């Protein structure tokens, strides 16, 4: 008998990750879980065919069903526009989804005992809470073709005043300019999510900004966090012998590098992007990271594989050549989404399944069965031999076999007791 | 006999670094070198007294004399305004100087064989070329008090057109907004400095941007670098078997973490700030880093101690307590400035002196004589005993003694040959 999984929004993606996504569903999910799956194809060709409407439709479906699982997608540049003959250079679908849902993206390494860290001191996890809204991801940027003034203005909705600031008077030649923004309510939601994560883990929290330079913009994040801490969380932190402190971003990246881990790090949108990749690589592998958007309603989540679409492997796959691609981040997008679905529905069987699949994934790699990219972490890519790893299909089949075993034994444990 | 040093602009700074700066001049520079020193006091109290004009005057003096050496300064926040009863919350003096001079700030770790790295793979140096102009450091940021529209506009100097872009329509509540810019000529100068640094070292060059998100703003940096590479440097790189490649910033920080070092990394202003601190800490210590602004004229430099003013030690010093503060980055600001002064003046004696003082500094620490902060790198701060390190004065005297020896022996080597 299969587990009744409930409603899940899935977003199909691109290139190698698109192939792996289908293998995960076929081999690891569908044989055990029956889902009311709302499928949106976010492949670059379908986003082009729908003028990117499919991306907005998927985000609206997540608001409705409360759980989304997303495959890695291409954010097209000039080369991609030429490759696919795109109508427009479509904006990041992750940016589109995040700006519709809002919230905080929590990112953490997926640790295997036999995969070495690059930062030896990191014995405890570092969890980044990346503010998912605004800043560079909803900016208006443009080329300044020549001499002239760039100004930024604010006009209150009543129409009773107008403030105009000179950004720059280009006196000789041109350049570039941009405007960006953030919202008080979004920053407040980011603060609440960060304080709640720290209390859930029993770890201290650090917020990074550059408020000495962006005195008003970054000063606002610092002020909102401090006001919310003082009024709503300080006694809770004190009860757990933890603390909250603001840090300048450049001091914070050095503090993190020198640390033993074991803290929550609240990052603005851009820093969360950069620093989560630095941290994932520091723990051993860029591809071994979870990424879950927690929305402000405290009910909606979107789990994703945050890494690239592995174009190099896709080109090999297109030529009918053997590939060996790490599917773990894509599997954990499904297990994190299904664990939330289970929490919302009080579904014990689904919660057990989601945790079991995470355990199987880690146990498989720790038993020495892994893809080429993971074998390269241990030995170095030029030293990897074909006898050191499993191809994509072989690895998925090994996970499938280990999953069947874990679930079979647990089923037998019930009937006995 | 003393070395005729020539003209140097010095900028005095704040707190503990201000005390160390005077010790360096008194013990290591003035007994050996006679300088035409143009002194500017950039202490927070003097910047307040002159309404920050001293900072602009110092930058103009560097343009005139071509060499500046700068002590670490305070960039005041709300707490500093209260502490010193400041007239205004003065902007970063580093930002003011850099935006007047322009150029690229080259940053690299100062390596000691007995100071352990936190990233074991980094066996070769990583040099960051941080674009010194514009972006967040010359931004216009403000609080949005409530609902209303933020717009950004461009008006060419002829007055024949006006382009207006909506940044955001705040429908409920307020937030923050900002405008920033960069200049084509400054980006071109940054590109030239980066390509020239890579060729000087015989190492590949990487530029990081987020052009998939800021398609026009970051796309411009990517385009200018590629055009300059193709037209002016590609054959030179090919002759040295090196290369230039653009990378997305989040991919680049992971690539750097996983690397063995040995490359030049061109960073936009904000990334150069953050990533140079991450890299300095990765090599072993935040305080062990050189930082030299190379201006576009190919004649002017400003060397600085890029770390903080060590307020914790200054508070101990104010209470008449013993302190042990690492002066190495402040010494290397002087040696890097004096080495450039020597290059401009074809002054062999000064060039020898600047290199000798760098050698003495590293040899002293490698012989096991160091400050508490460096002893903490080896043993861990809670494990450091007073028998493991020298106080500030003791360390400066040890450096002074070793410098006297190095210079005495070299003087004797001439007279013999
Ligand atoms: C994987 C590949 C195989 N099989 C190779 O033979 C190399 C050519 C190839 C280099 C580029 C590359 C990039 N990324 C991955 N794996 C990965 C990274 C991040 C997330 C998931 C997977 N693997 C490769 C290989 C090593
Ligand atoms: C230095 C100090 C001494 N002596 C102590 O006893 C500690 C209280 C103090 C903690 C804070 C601190 C910060 N920075 C430094 N050194 C430094 C850093 C960067 C550049 C130059 C110097 N040292 C301390 C000590 C360890
Ligand atoms: Ca990323
Ligand atoms: Ca810095």
UniProtKB/Swiss-Prot annotation, chains A, B:
Cofactor binding summary note: Binds 1 Mg(2+) or Mn(2+) ion per subunit.
Cofactor(s) it depends on: Mg(2+); Mn(2+)
Annotated site, Critical for catalysis, chain positions: 137, 210
GO BP, one annotated term: 2-oxoglutarate metabolic process
N6-acetyllysine carried by residues: 79, 222, 231, 241, 319
Posttranslational modification: Acetylation at Lys-372 dramatically reduces catalytic activity.
Top-level enzyme category: oxidoreductase
Entry-annotated residues carrying N6-succinyllysine: 124, 398
PROSITE patterns: IDH_IMDH
Catalyzed reactions: D-threo-isocitrate + NADP(+) = 2-oxoglutarate + CO2 + NADPH
Binding site for NADP(+): 73-75, 80, 258, 308-313, 326
Annotated phenotype, changing residue 130 to C: In colorectal cancer and glioma samples; glioblastoma multiforme; somatic mutation; found in patients with cartilaginous tumors; abolishes magnesium binding and alters enzyme activity so that isocitrate is no longer converted to alpha-ketoglutarate but instead alpha-ketoglutarate is converted to R(-)-2-hydroxyglutarate; induces histone methylation; enhances expression of chondrocyte-related genes; disturbs the formation of cartilaginous matrix; inhibits osteogenic differentiation
PTM-bearing positions, type Phosphoserine: 387
PANTHER family named in the record: ISOCITRATE DEHYDROGENASE [NADP] CYTOPLASMIC, NADP-SPECIFIC ISOCITRATE DEHYDROGENASE
Associated disease: Glioma: Gliomas are benign or malignant central nervous system neoplasms derived from glial cells. They comprise astrocytomas and glioblastoma multiforme that are derived from astrocytes, oligodendrogliomas derived from oligodendrocytes and ependymomas derived from ependymocytes.
Name this polypeptide is given: Isocitrate dehydrogenase [NADP] cytoplasmic
Name of the gene this protein is made from: IDH1
């Amino acid at each position: 008998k299969k587990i009744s999984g409930g409603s899940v929004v899935e977003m199909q993606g691109d290139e190698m990750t698109r192939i792996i996504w289908e293998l995960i569903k076929e081999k690891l999910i569908f044989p055990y879980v029956e889902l009311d799956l709302h499928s949106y194809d976010l492949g670059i060709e379908n986003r082009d065919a729908t003028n990117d409407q499919v991306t907005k439709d998927a985000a609206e479906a997540i608001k409705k069903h409360n759980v989304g699982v997303k495959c890695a997608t291409i954010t097209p540049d000039e080369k991609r526009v030429e490759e696919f003959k795109l109508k427009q250079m479509w904006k990041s679908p992750n940016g589109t989804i995040r700006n519709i849902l809002g919230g905080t993206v929590f990112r953490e390494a997926i640790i295997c005992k036999n995969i070495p860290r690059l930062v030896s001191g990191w014995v405890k996890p570092i969890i980044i809470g990346r503010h998912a809204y605004g800043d560079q991801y909803r900016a208006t940027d443009f080329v300044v073709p020549g001499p002239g003034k760039v100004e930024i203005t604010y006009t209150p909705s009543d129409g009773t005043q107008k403030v105009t600031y000179l950004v720059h008077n280009f006196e000789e030649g041109g350049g570039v300019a941009m405007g960006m923004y953030n919202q008080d309510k979004s920053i407040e939601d980011f603060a609440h999510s960060s304080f709640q994560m720290a209390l859930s883990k029993g770890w201290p929290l650090y917020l990074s900004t550059k408020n000495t330079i962006l005195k008003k913009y970054d000063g606002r994040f610092k002020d909102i966090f401090q006001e919310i801490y003082d009024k709503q969380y300080k006694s809770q932190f004190e009860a757990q012998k933890i603390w909250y402190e603001h840090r300048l971003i450049d001091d914070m990246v050095a503090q993190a590098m020198k640390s033993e881990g074991g803290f929550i790090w609240a990052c603005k949108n851009y820093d969360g992007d950069v620093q989560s990749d630095s941290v994932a690589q520091g723990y051993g592998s860029l591809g071994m990271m979870t990424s879950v958007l927690v929305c402000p309603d405290g009910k909606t989540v979107e789990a994703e594989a945050a890494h690239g679409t592995v174009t190099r492997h896709y080109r090999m796959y297109q030529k009918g050549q053997e590939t060996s691609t790490n599917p773990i981040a894509s599997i954990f997008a499904w297990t994190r989404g299904l664990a939330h679905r289970a929490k919302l529905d009080n579904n014990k069987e689904l919660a057990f399944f989601a945790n079991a699949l995470e355990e199987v994934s880690i146990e498989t790699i720790e038993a020495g069965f892994m893809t080429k990219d993971l074998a390269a972490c241990i030995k170095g890519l030029p030293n990897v031999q074909r006898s050191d790893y499993l191809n994509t299909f072989e690895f998925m089949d090994k996970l499938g076999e280990n999953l069947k075993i874990k679930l079979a034994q647990a089923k037998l444990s019930l009937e006995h007791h």
